[PDB]
Write a protein that binds this ligand. Structure first.
Ligand code: BCL
Ligand code: BCL
Ligand code: BCL
Ligand code: BCL
Ligand code: BCL
Ligand code: BCL
Ligand SMILES: CC(C)=CCC/C(C)=C\CC/C(C)=C/CC/C(C)=C\CC/C(C)=C/CC/C(C)=C/CC/C(C)=C/CC/C(C)=C/CC1=C(C)C(=O)c2ccccc2C1=O
Ligand SMILES: CCCCCC/C=C\CCCCCCCCCC(=O)O[C@H](COC(=O)CCCCCCCCCCCCCCC)COP(=O)(O)OC[C@@H](O)CO
Ligand SMILES: CCCCCC/C=C\CCCCCCCCCC(=O)O[C@H](COC(=O)CCCCCCCCCCCCCCC)COP(=O)(O)OC[C@@H](O)CO
Ligand SMILES: COC(C)(C)CCC/C(C)=C/C=C/C(C)=C/C=C/C(C)=C/C=C/C=C(C)/C=C/C=C(C)/C=C/C=C(\C)CCCC(C)(C)OC
Ligand SMILES: COC(C)(C)CCC/C(C)=C/C=C/C(C)=C/C=C/C(C)=C/C=C\C=C(C)\C=C\C=C(C)\C=C\C=C(/C)CCCC(C)(C)OC
Ligand SMILES: [Ca+2]
Lengths: 78, 272, 66, 257, 44, 73, 318, 72, 42, 43, 42, 43
C-alpha cells in the first residue's frame, strides 16, 4: 500500500500535545453545534412539542429592538 | 523623629533660593524657602475657600461652590462677590503647586538623585494650567474655567462635555483613556509580581530575577525587564496627562462642531 | 396645512408663522426631507437592527439611523 | 411628582458605609507593613535625650526571609549592623538643624556620599555563580555592533580634564546588560564607574562623567578581587560618585540664585 | 538536529494501534446519534 | 482486533498525570452542570417560575387578612 | 545634562535563556527565541519561548472561535465588502438581542450570535485564569497575580452576564464594537440619571487617578536612584542598600511619611484593585436597586442647588 | 522536460519543516471549515431555517393540545 | 514513564477510574428517567 | 544554511505518505460536493 | 507517598471522611423533606 | 556579505523546480478564469 509507514507519525509529533488538542477541540465543538442548532427552527426545548409547559403570554408580538424590558417571563414569541 | 539610619544624610546645601536661612527640618518635614511659600499659599487658599463657603447658602461639605466670573468680564477683573474671589484663589493654587515642585528639586539635589519626580509632576501642573489659563485665554474669557466645589465642578464637566453632543468621539480623549486603562493594568501586574517573588509558597526560598523573567515568558511569551517596567510606568502616566491637556485645548478653540463629525475625514479619504 | 399651522400652533410658531418660502425657498421640491430608511445592504436572512452604520442624519454617530 | 421619597434608608447607603470601613482598614495594614525598615525611630527630647518611639500604628511582629544557596535568614524588623564612623558638626543648636562634614567632604561618607553596610558576599545567579562580572570571565557575551563599543575611549571628567581610559565592561548575567565600566586612572589604578552616570559619545570616542572632576578619579574606592564584586563594594563605589554631585566644586552646595 | 519526541518505532506503533481503535469507536457512536436524530427530526 | 484492541488502554496513565486529570474532570463537570441548568431554566421547561403547582406571590396577595387591611385605606 | 536612563546606549548579547527548570512531568517549551534590536533599545530583547499546556490551548481555541464569530458578523453587516469594512470600521459592531426576548435564546441573526460570542469569550477567560495560577505556582511563587486577575474577570462578568440576568434581559449588555460600546456607556448613564452622582463611580475614579499618580511617583523614584543600583528591587528588599535609604528619605522629607521597598508594591496592588471593586459595586446596584442616581443624591443631601429666578411650566401638568 | 520537470520535488522536506507544516495545515483547515459553514448559513442556501422538509415551530403551535389551551 | 507511574500503578488507577465513571453514568441515567417521567421534552 | 536534519531517504518517505494523504482528503471533498450538488444546486 | 500519608493513615482518613459525608447528605435530605411539606415546587 | 549558503548548483536546482511549479499554478488559474467567464461574464 501507500499508507504502510503512517505509524511513524508519532516519532516527530508529540502524542501528549495531540491528545490535549483533540479533547479540547471536540468538547468546544460539541457546545458550539448545540448552541447553533438551538438558535434556529430546529430548536427542541421551546418548540411546544409535545406540549407547552409554561404560562406563556397570550399575545406576544414579533420583538423589535426599540422595546422595553418585559414584565413577566415568556418563551413563545413566534 | 529620625529613622535608624537618617542622621548621616541631613547635611546642608543643595538649595535654589534662600540659602542657609530656611535650611532646617520641622519634625520629619524639610522646610526651605519653598516650604514656607507652599504652606503660606495653601493656608491662604484654604481660608479663602472657607470664607467663600461662609457667604454662600450652606456649609455642607458636598454643596460648597465658588464660581468664576461671567463671560462678559472677558479677561478683566471681576467684583469680589461675583468672581474676584475665584481669581485670588486660583492665583494661590498656582503659587502652591509650583512651590511644591521646586521644593522637590531641592530635596533631590540634597540626596544626590535625579529629577524624575518633579519632572513628572510638571505635567499635572500643565493640565491644570491648560484648564484655567490657556484655554480661557484662547477663547477670550476667564469664565470658561471650572468652579471650586465637589459635585459642583462635576456639573461643569458634564455640561462642557455635552456642548459637543458626544464627547466620547474626541480623538485625543480616546488616546488618553487608552493610556489610563493600560496604566492601571500594568500597575496591578507589577505589584503582584514583586509581592509573589518575595512571598513564595510556604517553606521556600526567596526567588530571583530569572524567575521574574520566566513567569511572564511562560504566560505571554515576552518579558520587558525589571528596569524597563519603571520606565514604561513613567511613560504611560505622563502620556495620559499630556493627551488630556491636548484634548481640552482642541475643544472650543480649534473645533466647534460635534466631535463625531471630525472622524468623518476617515471614510471620506478618496481611497475606498 | 399652512393655515392650520399659522392659526392653531402658536405655542411653537408664535406670531412669526410660516409661508411657502419657509420650506420651498423658491424650488418645487424642498431641500431637507426624509423617508423611512431601509438601511445598508446585508444578506437576505439577516433582519435590520437599525444602527451600527455611519448614520448621516443622526450627526455621524453609530446611533439608530432612523 | 418628580421627586417623591418613599424611604430614607436603602442598600446603596449601607454598602457605601461598608466600603468606608474596608478602606480605612487596608490603610491600617499597609501602614503597619511600612515599618519593617528603619524603626523604632529616634525622638529627641526637650534637652537632647533620645528615645525610641514606634509611631501609630505600632510596629508589626518580625517575619523571616529565607535566602537561597544557604544565604542565611533575614528577620524584619530585626537588628541592624553598626554604622561606620561619620563625623558631623551641627550648624545651629536645635534638633532640626542641619550638619556640616568635618574633614575633606569627598572622603567622609556623609551627605549624598553616605552608603549602607551590606553583606560581604556577591549577588548570585539561579545557578550559584556571581552575577556581575567582567566580560573576560563571562566568555559568551558580545557587544552588538550598531552600538559604540566603549573599550578604548577616554573618560573626560566634568571640568574638561582626562580621568583615564576604559579597559573592560562589567555585565549582568541574570539580565544581560551593562552595569559598570572599568578604567585605568592617572595613577594606574583600576576603578569602576556605573553606566548610569556616563554619557557615551561614539564619534568623539569620549565618555563624559559630569559628577566628579578629572583629578578625582585617583581616589575612587577599589575592589579586593577583580573577578567579582560584593554588595558592600557596589555601595562604596556608587556613593563616592554621588558625593561629587555636591562636593566636587566648592560652589555646588551654594544656592543657585 | 531534527525534531523528535523520544518515542522509538515500537512505542509509535503501539500508540497508533490504540489511537485508531479509539477514533473508530468514537465515530461509530457519532453515526448512531445521527441516525436517531434523523428518525426523530429530519433536517434536510 | 475489534475484540482485544483496547487492552493497552491502562497505559494511558503513564503519559497523562492522574491527579491533574481528576481535577480537570471535576471542574469541567461542575461548570457543565451550572451551564445546563441555566440553559434549561431559560426555556419553556423552566420549573421555578411556572406557577405549578401554585403561584405563591399571588396566593399571598389574596389572603383574607391582607384583603381586609387593604380595604381599610 | 546627565544621562537620564531612558534608553539603552550599549547592547550586549549572549545565547538565549531557556528558563528556570519546571517540575518533572511537564511539557517542553515551544519556539526558538529571537532578538529585537528596537525592543532592546527600551527593554529586554528576547522574544519567546512560550509554554502551551492543557489550559492555554483550550483557551485560544475558545477565544479564536469567538473572534471569528465577531469578525464575521461585523463583515456581514456591510454586505461582505472588505473595502467598506476598512472604510467604516469604527462604526461596526455585533449587537445584543432585542430586550423583548428576555432571557430566552433568540434566533441566530437577531441576537444569537452575540450570545455565542459571549459564551466563548467567557470560557476563554476562565481557562486563562487557571493557566496564570498554575504557571505561577509551578515555579514556587505566590499566587498574587491570580487574585487581581480574578477581580478583573468578575467585572467583565458583572456587566454582561450578572446584571443582565438580574434585570431580566440580555439586551441590557454592551455590544462588540468601538463606537457602539461608547454609545452604550453614554446611554446607560443617561437612562439611570447621571453617573456623576453614583458614589461608587466617584470612588473608582478616585482610585484610577490614584493609580496614575502612584505609578508616576514610583517609576520616577526608582529611575532617580538607579545610579545606586535601585532598579534591582529584590536585593534592596533582602539587603537594604543606599538606594532604598535615599528613596525613603525623599518621600519622608517631602510629605512627612514613607513606605519601604517591599510595602510600596502592596500599595500598588490595592490601588489597582479597589478601582475595579468599586466598578463592580456601582454597576451591580444600577437599575436593580436605584433608578435615578441624581434623585438619590438629592435625598441624601449631596447635590448643589443653583439659584432659579424663573418659572418653567411642565406641559404635561397643563 | 515537461515530464521530468518535477523530479527532485521530494527534496522539499529538506528545507521545509514537516512538523510545522503539519500543524499549520490542520489548524488552517479547521478555521476554513468554520468560516465557510458560517458564510453559507448566512445566505439563501441556509439549511437549518428553510422550513424544509417541514417547519417545526409552526408544527408545535398547531398541535390540538396547544390549540385547545390557547382557546381559553 | 513520563508520569513516574509504573505499569502496575497505572493498572490499579485504571481499574478504579473505570468503576467510578460507570457508577457516575448510572446515576445520570437515573436522573434522566425521573425527569422524563415528570416533564417529557421530546 | 537552513536545513531540517532530514536526509534524502527520510524526505522521500515523508513525501510518499504526504501525497497519499492529500489525495485521499481531496477525494472525500469531491464526494461531499457531488452530494451537495445533487441535493441543493447553487450555480 | 506523594502526600506523605502511609496506607494506614489513608485508611483512617477515608473512614472518617465517608462517615462525615454520609451525615451531611442525611441532613440535606431532611431539609428537603421539610421544604416539600411546606412549599412544594414541582 | 549577505549569503544563503547555497552553492551555484543548488541554486540552479531550486530554480528549475520553482519555475516549473509557478508555471503549473498559473495554468490552473487560467483554467479557472475561462470557466468563470463562460458562466458569469464580468466585463
Ligand atoms: C459628559 C462628559 C464626558 C467627559 C468630559 C470631559 C471633560 C470636560 C474633561 C474630561 C477629562 C478627562 N476625561 Mg472625560 N468625559 C467623559 C467620559 C470619560 C470616561 C469614561 C469611562 O466614560 C473616562 C475614562 C474619561 C477620562 C478622562 C481623562 C482622559 C481626563 C481626566 C484626567 C485628567 O484630566 O488629568 C489631568 C490632571 C489634573 C487636571 C489634576 C491637577 C493636579 C493638580 C496640579 C494637583 C492638585 C493637588 C491638590 C490641590 C492637593 C490636595 C492636597 C491634599 C493634602 C491631599 N472621561 C464623558 C463623555 N472629560 C478632562 C481633561 O482632559 O482635562 C485636561 C476634562 O477637562
Ligand atoms: C435535536 C438534536 C438532538 C441532539 C443531537 C445530537 C447529535 C447528532 C450528537 C449529539 C451528541 C451529544 N449530545 Mg446531543 N442532542 C440533543 C440534545 C442534547 C442535550 C440537551 C440538554 O438537550 C444534551 C446535554 C446533549 C449532549 C450530548 C453529548 C452526550 C454528546 C456530545 C459529546 C461531546 O460533546 O463530545 C465530547 C468528545 C470528546 C471529549 C472526545 C471523544 C470522547 C472520548 C471517547 C472520551 C469522552 C468520554 C465520553 C465518551 C463522553 C461522551 C459520553 C457518551 C458515552 C457519548 N444533547 C437533541 C435532542 N447530539 C454527539 C454524540 O452523540 O457523540 C457520540 C452527536 O453526534
Ligand atoms: C427539570 C430539570 C430538573 C433537573 C434535572 C436534572 C438531570 C437530568 C440531572 C440533574 C443533575 C443534578 N441536578 Mg438537577 N434538575 C432540576 C433541579 C435541580 C435543582 C434546583 C435548585 O432546582 C438543583 C440544586 C439540582 C441539582 C443537581 C445536582 C445534584 C446534579 C448535578 C450535579 C453535578 O453537577 O455534579 C458535578 C460534580 C462532579 C461530577 C464531581 C464528581 C463527583 C463528586 C465528588 C460527588 C458529588 C455527588 C453528587 C452531587 C450526587 C450526590 C448524590 C448521592 C449519590 C446521594 N437540580 C430540575 C427539577 N438534574 C444531574 C445528576 O443528578 O447527576 C447524577 C443530572 O443528570
Ligand atoms: C448545504 C451545505 C451542506 C454541507 C456541505 C459541505 C461540503 C461541500 C463539505 C462539507 C464538509 C464538512 N462538513 Mg458539511 N454541510 C452541511 C452541514 C454540516 C453540518 C451541520 C451541523 O449542519 C456539520 C456539523 C457539517 C460538518 C462537516 C465536516 C464533517 C466537514 C468539514 C471537515 C473539516 O473541516 O476538516 C478539517 C480537518 C482536517 C483536514 C484534518 C483531518 C480530518 C480528520 C482526521 C477527520 C475529519 C472528519 C472526516 C473528513 C470525516 C470522517 C472520516 C470519514 C468518515 C472516513 N456539515 C450542509 C448540509 N459540508 C467538507 C468535507 O466533508 O470534506 C471532507 C466539505 O467539502
Ligand atoms: C423555601 C426554602 C427554605 C430553605 C430551604 C433549604 C434547603 C433545602 C436547605 C437549606 C440549607 C440551609 N439553610 Mg435554608 N431555607 C430557607 C431559609 C433559610 C434562611 C433565611 C434567613 O431565610 C437561612 C439563614 C437559611 C440557612 C440555611 C443553612 C443552615 C443551610 C445551608 C448550609 C450551608 O450553606 O452549608 C455550607 C457549609 C458547609 C457544608 C460546611 C460543612 C459543615 C460544617 C462543619 C459546619 C456547618 C454547620 C451547619 C451550617 C448547620 C447544621 C447544624 C445542625 C444544628 C445539626 N435557610 C427557606 C425557608 N435550606 C441546606 C441544609 O440544611 O444543609 C444540610 C439545605 O439543604
Ligand atoms: C464567481 C466566482 C466563482 C469562483 C471563481 C474563481 C476563480 C477565477 C479562481 C477561483 C479559485 C479558487 N476557488 Mg473559486 N469561485 C467560486 C466559488 C468558490 C467557493 C465557494 C465556497 O463558493 C470556494 C470555497 C472556492 C475556492 C476556490 C479555491 C479552490 C481556489 C482558491 C485557491 C487558493 O486560494 O490557493 C492559494 C493558496 C496556495 C497557492 C497555497 C499553496 C498550496 C498548494 C499549491 C496546494 C493548494 C491546493 C489548491 C487550493 C487547489 C488546487 C486544486 C486541485 C487541483 C484539486 N471558490 C465562484 C463560483 N475561484 C482560484 C483557483 O482556481 O486557483 C487555481 C481562481 O483563480
Ligand atoms: C498646613 C498646616 C496647618 C501647617 C502647619 C505646620 C507647619 C507650621 C509646618 C510644617 C512644615 C511643612 C513645610 C509642611 C508641609 C506639609 C503639609 C502641611 C502638607 C502636605 C501633606 C501631603 C501633601 C500629603 C498627601 C499625601 C497623599 C494623599 C499621598 C498620595 C499618594 C499615596 C497615598 C502614597 C502612599 C504610598 C507612598 C507612601 C509612597 C511613597 C513612596 C514611593 C512612591 C516609592 O516609590 C518608594 C520606593 C522605595 C521606598 C519607599 C518609597 C515610598 O515611600
Ligand atoms: C500662549 C497661548 C495663547 C497664544 C495665542 C494668542 C492668539 C490669539 C489670542 C487672541 C484671541 C482672544 C479672543 C478674541 C475674542 C474674544 C474677545 C476679546 O476679548 O478679544 C480681544 C482681546 O484680545 C486679547 O486679549 C489678546 C491677548 C493675547 C495675549 C497672549 C499672550 C500670553 C502671555 C501672558 C503670560 C503671562 C478684544 O478685547 P476686548 O473685547 O476689548 O476686551 C474686553 C474684555 O476682555 C474686558 O472688558
Ligand atoms: C479517550 C479520550 C482521550 C482523552 C485523553 C486526554 C485526557 C484528558 C485531558 C488531560 C487533562 O485533563 O490534563 C489537563 C488539561 O486540562 C484541560 O484540557 C482543560 C480543558 C478541558 C475542557 C476543555 C473545554 C472547556 C470546557 C468549558 C470551560 C470550563 C471552565 C472552567 C474554568 C474554571 C491538565 O493539563 P496539563 O497538566 O498541562 O497536562 C499534563 C499532563 O497531563 C500531560 O502532559
Ligand atoms: C507509554 O505510552 C505509550 C506511547 C508507549 C503507549 C500508549 C498507548 C495509549 C494509552 C494510547 C491512548 C490513545 C487514545 C485514548 C486515543 C484517543 C483517540 C481519539 C478519541 C481520537 C478522535 C479524533 C477525532 C477527530 C480527529 C475529529 C475531528 C473533527 C473535525 C476536525 C471536525 C471539523 C468540523 C467542522 C469544521 C464543522 C463546523 C460546522 C459548524 C456548523 C459548527 O461550523 C460553523
Ligand atoms: C474579518 O475578520 C475575520 C473573520 C477574518 C477575523 C478578524 C477579527 C476582528 C477584526 C475582530 C474585531 C473585534 C472588535 C473591534 C471587538 C470590539 C470589542 C469591544 C470593545 C467589546 C466591549 C465589550 C463587550 C462586553 C463587556 C461583553 C460582555 C459579554 C458577556 C459577559 C457574555 C455573557 C454570556 C454568557 C456567559 C452566555 C450565556 C448563554 C446561556 C446559554 C447560558 O443563556 C441561557
Ligand atoms: Ca432544512
Amino acid at each position: 500500500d501507500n499508507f504502510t509507514g503512517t505509524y511513524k507519525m508519532w516519532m516527530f509529533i508529540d502524542p501528549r500535545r495531540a491528545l490535549l488538542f483533540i479533547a479540547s477541540f471536540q468538547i468546544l465543538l460539541g457546545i458550539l453545534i448545540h448552541m447553533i442548532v438551538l438558535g434556529s427552527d430546529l430548536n427542541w426545548h421551546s418548540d411546544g412539542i409535545p406540549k407547552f409547559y409554561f404560562p406563556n403570554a397570550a399575545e406576544a408580538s414579533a420583538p423589535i429592538d426599540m422595546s422595553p424590558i418585559p414584565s413577566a417571563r415568556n418563551f413563545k414569541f413566534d | 523623629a529620625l529613622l535608624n539610619f537618617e542622621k548621616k544624610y541631613r547635611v546642608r546645601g543643595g538649595t535654589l533660593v534662600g540659602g542657609d536661612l530656611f535650611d532646617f527640618w520641622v519634625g520629619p518635614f524639610y522646610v526651605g524657602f519653598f516650604g514656607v511659600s507652599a504652606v503660606f499659599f495653601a493656608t491662604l487658599g484654604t481660608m479663602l475657600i472657607l470664607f467663600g463657603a461662609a457667604i454662600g447658602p450652606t456649609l455642607n461639605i458636598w454643596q460648597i461652590s465658588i464660581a468664576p466670573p461671567d463671560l462678559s468680564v472677558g479677561l478683566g477683573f471681576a467684583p469680589i462677590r461675583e468672581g474676584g474671589l475665584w481669581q485670588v484663589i486660583t492665583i494661590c493654587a498656582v503659587g502652591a503647586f509650583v512651590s511644591w515642585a521646586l521644593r522637590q528639586v531641592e530635596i533631590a539635589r540634597k540626596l544626590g538623585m535625579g529629577l524624575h519626580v518633579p519632572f513628572a509632576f510638571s505635567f499635572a501642573i500643565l493640565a491644570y494650567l491648560t484648564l484655567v489659563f490657556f484655554r480661557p485665554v484662547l477663547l477670550g474669557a476667564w469664565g470658561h474655567a471650572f468652579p471650586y466645589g465637589l459635585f459642583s465642578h462635576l456639573d461643569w464637566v458634564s455640561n462642557v462635555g455635552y456642548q459637543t453632543l458626544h464627547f466620547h468621539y474626541n480623538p485625543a480623549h480616546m488616546l488618553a483613556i487608552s493610556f489610563f486603562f493600560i496604566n492601571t493594568l500594568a500597575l496591578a501586574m507589577h505589584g503582584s509580581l514583586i509581592l509573589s517573588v518575595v512571598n513564595p509558597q510556604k517553606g521556600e526560598e526567596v526567588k530571583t530575577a530569572e524567575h521574574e523573567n520566566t513567569v511572564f515568558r511562560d504566560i505571554v511569551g515576552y518579558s520587558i525587564g525589571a528596569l524597563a517596567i519603571h520606565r514604561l510606568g513613567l511613560f504611560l502616566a505622563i502620556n495620559a496627562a499630556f493627551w488630556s491637556a491636548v484634548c481640552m485645548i482642541l475643544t472650543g478653540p480649534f473645533w466647534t462642531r460635534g466631535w463625531p463629525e471630525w472622524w468623518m475625514w476617515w471614510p471620506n479619504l478618496p481611497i475606498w | 396645512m399652512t393655515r392650520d399651522t399659522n392659526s392653531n400652533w402658536t405655542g411653537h410658531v408664535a406670531d412669526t408663522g410660516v409661508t411657502c418660502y419657509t420650506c420651498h425657498r423658491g424650488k418645487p421640491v424642498p431641500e431637507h426631507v426624509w423617508t423611512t430608511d431601509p438601511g445598508p445592504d446585508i444578506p437576505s436572512v439577516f433582519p435590520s437592527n437599525g444602527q451600527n452604520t455611519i448614520g448621516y442624519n443622526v450627526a455621524y454617530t453609530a446611533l439608530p439611523f432612523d | 411628582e418628580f421627586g417623591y421619597i418613599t424611604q430614607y434608608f436603602d442598600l446603596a447607603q449601607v454598602t457605601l458605609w461598608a466600603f468606608w470601613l474596608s478602606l480605612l482598614s487596608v490603610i491600617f495594614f499597609n501602614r503597619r507593613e511600612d515599618k519593617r525598615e528603619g524603626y523604632p525611630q529616634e525622638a529627641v527630647q526637650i534637652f537632647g535625650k533620645t528615645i525610641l518611639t514606634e509611631g501609630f500604628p505600632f510596629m508589626p511582629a518580625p517575619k523571616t526571609f529565607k535566602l537561597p544557596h544557604n544565604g542565611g535568614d533575614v528577620v524584619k524588623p530585626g537588628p541592624e549592623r553598626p554604622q561606620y564612623d561619620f563625623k558631623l558638626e551641627q550648624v545651629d543648636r536645635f534638633a532640626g538643624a542641619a550638619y556640616r562634614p568635618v574633614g575633606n567632604p569627598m572622603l567622609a561618607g556623609v551627605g549624598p556620599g553616605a552608603y549602607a553596610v551590606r553583606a560581604n558576599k556577591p549577588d548570585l545567579t539561579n545557578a550559584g555563580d556571581p552575577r556581575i562580572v567582567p566580560m573576560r570571565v563571562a566568555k559568551h557575551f558580545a557587544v552588538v555592533d550598531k552600538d559604540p563599543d566603549p573599550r578604548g575611549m577616554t573618560v573626560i571628567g566634568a571640568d574638561g580634564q582626562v580621568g583615564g581610559k576604559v579597559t573592560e565592561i562589567w555585565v549582568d548575567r541574570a539580565e544581560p546588560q551593562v552595569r559598570y565600566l572599568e578604567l585605568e586612572a592617572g595613577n594606574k589604578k583600576k576603578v569602576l564607574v556605573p553606566i548610569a552616570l556616563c554619557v557615551i559619545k561614539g564619534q568623539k570616542r569620549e565618555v563624559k562623567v559630569r559628577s566628579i572632576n578629572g583629578i578625582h578619579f585617583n581616589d575612587v574606592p577599589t575592589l579586593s578581587n577583580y573577578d567579582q564584586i560584593t554588595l558592600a563594594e557596589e555601595d562604596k563605589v556608587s556613593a563616592y560618585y554621588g558625593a561629587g554631585t555636591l562636593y566636587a566644586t566648592p560652589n555646588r552646595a551654594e544656592s543657585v540664585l | 538536529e531534527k525534531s523528535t519526541t523520544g518515542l522509538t518505532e515500537a512505542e509509535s506503533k503501539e500508540f497508533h494501534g490504540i489511537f485508531m481503535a479509539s477514533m473508530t469507536l468514537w465515530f461509530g457512536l457519532v453515526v448512531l446519534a445521527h441516525i436517531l436524530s434523523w428518525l426523530y427530526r429530519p433536517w434536510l | 482486533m475489534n475484540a482485544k484492541s483496547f487492552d493497552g488502554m491502562h497505559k494511558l496513565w503513564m503519559i497523562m498525570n492522574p491527579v491533574s486529570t481528576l481535577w480537570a474532570i471535576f471542574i469541567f463537570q461542575i461548570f457543565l452542570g451550572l451551564l445546563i441548568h441555566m440553559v434549561v431554566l431559560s426555556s419553556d421547561l423552566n420549573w421555578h417560575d411556572d406557577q405549578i403547582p401554585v403561584g405563591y406571590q399571588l396566593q399571598g396577595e389574596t389572603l383574607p387578612v391582607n384583603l381586609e387591611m387593604k380595604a381599610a385605606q | 545634562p546627565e544621562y537620564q536612563n531612558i534608553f539603552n546606549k550599549v547592547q550586549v548579547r549572549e545565547p538565549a535563556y531557556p528558563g528556570v527548570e519546571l517540575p518533572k512531568g511537564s511539557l517542553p517549551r515551544v519556539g526558538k527565541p529571537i532578538f529585537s534590536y528596537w525592543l532592546g533599545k527600551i527593554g529586554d530583547a528576547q522574544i519567546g519561548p512560550l509554554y502551551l499546556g492543557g489550559w492555554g490551548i483550550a483557551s485560544l481555541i475558545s477565544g479564536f472561535i469567538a473572534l471569528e464569530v465577531i469578525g464575521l458578523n461585523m463583515l456581514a453587516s456591510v454586505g461582505w465588502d472588505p473595502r467598506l469594512f476598512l472604510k467604516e470600521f469604527f462604526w461596526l459592531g455585533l449587537e445584543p438581542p432585542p430586550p423583548a426576548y428576555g432571557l430566552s435564546i433568540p434566533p441566530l441573526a437577531e441576537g444569537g450570535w452575540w450570545l455565542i460570542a459571549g459564551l466563548f469569550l467567557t470560557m476563554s477567560l476562565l481557562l486563562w485564569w487557571v493557566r496564570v495560577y498554575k504557571r505561577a505556582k509551578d515555579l514556587g511563587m505566590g499566587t498574587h497575580l491570580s487574585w487581581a486577575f480574578a477581580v478583573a474577570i468578575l467585572f467583565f462578568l458583572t456587566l454582561g452576564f450578572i446584571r443582565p440576568v438580574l434585570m431580566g434581559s440580555w439586551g441590557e449588555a454592551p455590544p462588540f464594537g468601538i463606537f457602539p460600546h461608547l454609545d452604550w456607556t453614554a446611554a446607560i448613564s443617561i437612562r439611570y440619571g447621571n453617573f456623576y452622582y453614583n458614589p461608587f463611580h466617584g470612588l473608582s475614579i478616585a482610585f484610577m487617578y490614584g493609580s496614575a499618580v502612584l505609578f508616576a511617583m514610583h517609576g520616577g523614584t526608582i529611575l532617580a536612584v538607579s545610579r545606586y543600583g535601585g532598579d534591582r528591587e529584590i536585593d534592596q528588599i533582602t539587603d537594604r542598600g543606599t538606594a532604598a535609604e535615599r528613596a525613603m528619605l525623599f518621600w519622608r522629607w517631602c510629605m512627612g511619611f514613607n513606605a519601604s521597598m517591599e510595602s510600596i508594591h502592596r500599595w500598588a496592588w490595592w490601588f489597582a484593585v479597589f478601582c475595579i471593586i468599586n466598578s463592580i459595586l456601582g454597576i451591580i446596584l444600577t437599575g436593580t436597586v436605584v433608578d435615578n442616581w441624581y434623585l438619590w443624591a438629592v435625598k441624601h443631601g449631596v447635590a448643589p442647588s443653583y439659584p432659579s429666578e424663573l418659572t418653567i411650566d411642565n406641559p404635561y401638568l397643563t
